[PDB]
Amino acid sequence: VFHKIRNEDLIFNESLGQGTFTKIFKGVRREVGDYGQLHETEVLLKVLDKAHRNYSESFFEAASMMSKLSHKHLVLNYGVCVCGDENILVQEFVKFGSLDTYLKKNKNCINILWKLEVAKQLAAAMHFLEENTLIHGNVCAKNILLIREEDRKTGNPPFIKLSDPGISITVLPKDILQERIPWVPPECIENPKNLNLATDKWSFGTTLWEICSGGDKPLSALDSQRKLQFYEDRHQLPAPKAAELANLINNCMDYEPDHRPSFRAIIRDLNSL
């Protein structure tokens, strides 16, 4: 279970965007830290919409299991605030935000080595989850956070963390799942209860495509009906302009879930490049 944080110890500041049935804010948490020192800590406040409070269990189940495992590439959740009529997840504040936005704003200076390094880090996080048989369920660039930028001057690579998946696709309305094609894999469009470790391998491929496409959203030009037919006709995504990872993307986005490669094999493939 999560640590409970009092509403009185939280300050809400600027909106940082939205997720499915959620709103995201920068905030501050007043707390007693190590050695009894008082801190005012920057936090990320993720607020479930009041009109959708019936999703609260799924909303928190998302963060909870992951938070039971500690890992350098997994986002740190501090706790929850459920004072009053609020359902709030309190998470570490990451300096450079989510990867979808970062890729869009920085595509003109993100090269193949940056992408490869980010791909390796995401794959390491997914390998850790796979070895713990823990399904994420919503791997996408919007759920990757950039802790540290690349610094060629000190040879330092960028550093990312995988964030929580949000409300599960197993409880979400069908139209939202359809709009999430091609992150949601075909077997889960057919039946959301098919959610499996193999799900994350497909979504990881879609996420690599995002990383390689400067923040473009694959199939964004297709409405929901056409995204459905894309799966019915068994199409693959087009290779990104910088196509170094295209074979890996397509191997991960295998319409046969049992044929998708282990994250160990994915990592060995990345290391070959």
Ligand X SMILES: N#Cc1ccc(Nc2nc(N)cc(-n3cnc(CCO)c3)n2)cc1
* 91 sits near ligand X (criterion: CB under 6 A): yes
CB of 122 to ligand X, least distance (A): 14
* 92 sits near ligand X (criterion: CB under 6 A): yes
Question: Residues 237, 249: contact at Cβ < 8 Å?
Answer: yes
CB of 262 to ligand X, least distance (A): 26
Residues 126-185 that bind ligand X (CB under 6 A): 142-143, 145, 163
Question: Residues 82, 192: contact at Cβ < 8 Å?
Answer: no
Stretch touching ligand X by CB under 6 A, among 15-23, 30-38, 179-187, 191-199: 15-23
CB of 159 to ligand X, least distance (A): 13
Q: How far is CA 223 from the centre of its chain?
A: 23
Size of the site for ligand X (CB under 6 A): 17
CB of 28 to ligand X, least distance (A): 13
* 44 sits near ligand X (criterion: CB under 6 A): yes
Task: Output the CA angle 240-246-251, nearest 5 degrees.
Answer: 145
| Longest pairwise C-alpha distance within the chain | 61
Measuring CA to CA, how many Å separate 198 from each of 16, 48, 121, 172, 205?
A: 31, 28, 19, 19, 11
* 49 sits near ligand X (criterion: CB under 6 A): no
Q: Compare residues 45 and 198 and give the one whose CB is closer to ligand X.
A: 45
Residue from the set 4, 13, 17, 151 that interacts with ligand X by CB under 6 A = 17
Measuring CA to CA, how many Å separate 235 from each of 105, 192, 225, 231?
A: 29, 20, 14, 6
Task: Give the integer Cα–Cα distance in Å for 139 and 137.
Answer: 6
* 206 sits near ligand X (criterion: CB under 6 A): no
* 58 sits near ligand X (criterion: CB under 6 A): no
Placement of tokens 């970062």 in the chain: 102
CB of 26 to ligand X, least distance (A): 7
Crossing angle between the packed helical segments 263-272 and 197-212, to the nearest 10 degrees: 30
CB of 24 to ligand X, least distance (A): 5
CB of 169 to ligand X, least distance (A): 15
Q: According to DSSP H, which parts of 154-242 are helical? A: 174-179, 186-190, 197-212, 224-232
Stretch touching ligand X by CB under 6 A, among 54-62, 65-73, 92-100, 124-132: 92-100
Q: Which residue, 199, 202, 18, 201, is CA-closest to 101? A: 18
List contacts with ligand X (CB under 6 A).
16-17, 19, 24, 44, 91-98, 142-143, 145, 163
